Design a protein around this ligand. Sequence first.
Ligand SMILES: Nc1nc2c(ncn2[C@@H]2O[C@H](COP(=O)(O)OP(=O)(O)O)[C@@H](O)[C@H]2O)c(=O)[nH]1
Ligand SMILES: [Mn+2]
Length: 346
Amino acid sequence: MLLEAIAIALTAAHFGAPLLYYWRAKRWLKKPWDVAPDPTYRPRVTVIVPTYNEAPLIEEKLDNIYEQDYPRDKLEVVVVDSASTDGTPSAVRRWAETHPDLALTLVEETERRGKAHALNTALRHATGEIVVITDADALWPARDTLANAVKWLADPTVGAVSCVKRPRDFYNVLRVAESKAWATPIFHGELAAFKRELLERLGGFPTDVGADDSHTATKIAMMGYRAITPPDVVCVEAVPKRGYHAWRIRRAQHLVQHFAKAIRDGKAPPPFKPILHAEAYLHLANPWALPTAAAALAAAAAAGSLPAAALLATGAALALYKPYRTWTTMQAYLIAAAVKNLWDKE
Ligand SMILES: Nc1nc2c(ncn2[C@@H]2O[C@H](COP(=O)(O)OP(=O)(O)O)[C@@H](O)[C@H]2O)c(=O)[nH]1
Ligand SMILES: [Mn+2]
């Protein structure tokens, strides 16, 4: 009956860890920000939209950037497209001449070499103090979204700002709590704002990691700057429609590469090290504890004891309730990401 022991031990560990971490997040959450947004801070801003074959959405994406209240003499746009088959370059060119007061630079590249490479080239042609990366399928809900993020970058210790997303609460809590404590290791591509000096020390975006926003936020936090996601900087998450599950596992893959590579570079500031280690644990270790328990009880069930069959029937019965479904499928995504990662490289 020792596989029931190991099963309920592993289940207690797997579900115990995130809830203790959530409780420590909620005590950080009730401590006030040690940095302040400044509404008169007005630096030069470069918004970069990297695009590969997104001719449908990029006209309306440009219209969405165009409609920000942010003052236009301090705003410029670089649409970086590295050899798209669709007519995206002269779609942006067409729009570019329909909206002339908005400074636009379409830089085009020999050859597609991935998102980070495109971003790196766009960086050298950018003139702003703040660089905002945003995905072409991302739309900013308000006309002061951009200004809200910028207001949060005024403090010299804040190196990077990203948004809180809406369409779980637990996920958001971890974000803003880690932000208040020091930094959050997960940023969002819907809006990722960096100080150009910092990108330029790092320097630029490196090709090796999938989650460029989160990896850059994490290395800026490693340097002693704040990487934060304030609750009033909110974007809408762009859900893909096709291949929802493949899309979510590929995001999980980016997160697992990022956390695996991040923990292997020691020396985190004392405020960050518990955040970094907890998030890396939840992303690299805890998922495995789940299906190991499930297999322990499956073997215990098919042969022998079958209180284990009651435990798996209760597991399915708890798939009734939708937060359990969300959590278990996120763990599933993470496990698939780990194996897809290991066999992807060869
Ligand atoms: N220039 C360039 N842009 C890219 C490339 N790959 C992705 N992008 C852009 O990166 C943004 C996000 O890509 P997406 O496929 O939606 O990734 P996902 O949202 O995580 O599924 C989009 O605006 C794309 O246009 C690339 O190889 N070159
Ligand atoms: Mn997308």
